[PDB]
Amino acid sequence: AMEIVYDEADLRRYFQTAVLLDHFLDDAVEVDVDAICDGEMVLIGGIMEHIEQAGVHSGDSACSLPAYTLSQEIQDVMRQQVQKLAFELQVRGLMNVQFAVKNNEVYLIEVNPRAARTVPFVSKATGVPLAKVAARVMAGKSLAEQGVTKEVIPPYYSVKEVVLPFNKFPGVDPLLGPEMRSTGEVMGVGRTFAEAFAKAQLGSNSTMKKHGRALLSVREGDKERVVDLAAKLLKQGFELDATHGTAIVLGEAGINPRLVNKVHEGRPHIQDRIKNGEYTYIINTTSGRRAIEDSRVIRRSALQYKVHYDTTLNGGFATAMALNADATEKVISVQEMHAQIK
């Protein structure tokens, strides 16, 4: 059971309720790299950029292969580090490495010296059966002997999205965090990231629509980038609702959402509006135990009412991009996918 303490008081408050301590890498991109070491060389299976930032468990994060925003440059630094780690720790077969990118800096989060859960997706995505390869390495056949020595970068994007069991446990706050709660995953294949993401999103049973009213209620950190999300939604045809401070931020930028009351503020409030079906999209971000506790009503309603919702700004942007794609437009077989690989 992890925790992200924000302040001193927070700390106590934690222990009370409650040991390692790690500085939390706020606003960093999380990445996973799957690889194979045969003692002689390292084979990079895949570099997957997560959509949800570090702090949202990698198992609960949607992710993309190839990276959708990371510079090749910083990806090179990761590949090198993966390499140094592989040789140093004497890996023989699969490994997984998790990093956090912040301010153009690579930070190591952990090393899993075995097959990680990302293995099948990377394999489907790249056409290389890494578990068969790594198993051959284990039994003694080298990467070189098997002919699997060069990293494969596919010509299309593969996006992985997860499914959470929150609807099975209503009393739980359907919020993402450092601890993994998802039961499964799906894969979206597209020409662009928007396209992959849209397939991934639909595949994951998302109720997201291409029109309607969107409710925006974001935390302080999010106040800046929210403006841009709000316009993208505007550009797409949605109308907007916003709670107090979010409305303020949007107002100051020129966006004037319809103001909506928090449960405490009066009626009608969000709960009522959600209950009524006024929304087709909800973007709600939060930060701080207490802040989280209050906003619980939103997610709870959103889930109960089947309204698609994002709890991270990164996810919101990803959702916004997919609005530009059409998941039903084109289909492709795995055989065809793999045949496109040069």
Add this chain to the structure above:
Amino acid sequence: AMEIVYDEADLRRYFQTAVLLDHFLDDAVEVDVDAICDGEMVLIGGIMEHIEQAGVHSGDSACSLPAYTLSQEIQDVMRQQVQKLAFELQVRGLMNVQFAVKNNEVYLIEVNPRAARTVPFVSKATGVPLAKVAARVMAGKSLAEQGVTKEVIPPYYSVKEVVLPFNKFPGVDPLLGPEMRSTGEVMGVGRTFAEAFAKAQLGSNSTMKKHGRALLSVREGDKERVVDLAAKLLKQGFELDATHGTAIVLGEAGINPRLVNKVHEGRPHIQDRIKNGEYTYIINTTSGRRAIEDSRVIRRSALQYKVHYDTTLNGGFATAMALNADATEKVISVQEMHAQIK
């Protein structure tokens, strides 16, 4: 000393800091009627309909001759009532009667069996020198004998607005009530109530602009009608800002102002805005000893920064109507005015 108490709490509260008790006619139109009685008959000098509701002292209320909203049927009752009083009281000379109209019902405020401060305005409006006649009547010369027996109804609108000394006493809260504080008055003459109001407004040294951003912050009782007012403002090309509760009501009507913070909510706040000359108009209504003391900065700032502001919704509608008029478009002389009277 008069004040309106709203609840049990409030009443002691008063008595504390502090005798007749009278029920307060809320959301009522105040009316003034000047009249002459000689024992034989009653001449109606004029029926004036206040812009500001009962609760804002007549003396500080803007007014209209002829009535701009009241039905003929209701004036008829007041006319009826006045006569009854005159004879009843044995009025010989001038008299004044104040009424309040609630739900199509006429309530009697007071009777002043003497010359009222409205006499000169009525005289000027109607061409009938009420003071001369009444004196004559007082000395023994009947209306009949004077040949002043019919109620004159002007072909033009006559609006009286007042001037308040707030600017000379900064420490004071520039807000209207049951006690009179104005020192003078002005008159506006027009083809329409709007044109008349517009002249009276300009006459009163108002800083009202025909463009800019308006700030709307209104009470509960007003939250409903404010929509129409907001619409007018928008139709006129103003941009709107609203405090929370007001913003909620508008938005719920399709009207999304720019949300703004009270002083206690954040920076920038209203005071700041005002201070920055961000507004050209402010509509601020309040109810309650506290809601009032809490809004004080709005009015003080507004007065101090020379921004035109109205403290009644009625006053705000009038201001709006006047936006459709040109005070400097047409001029007329008292002589012509009177010449127009048949």
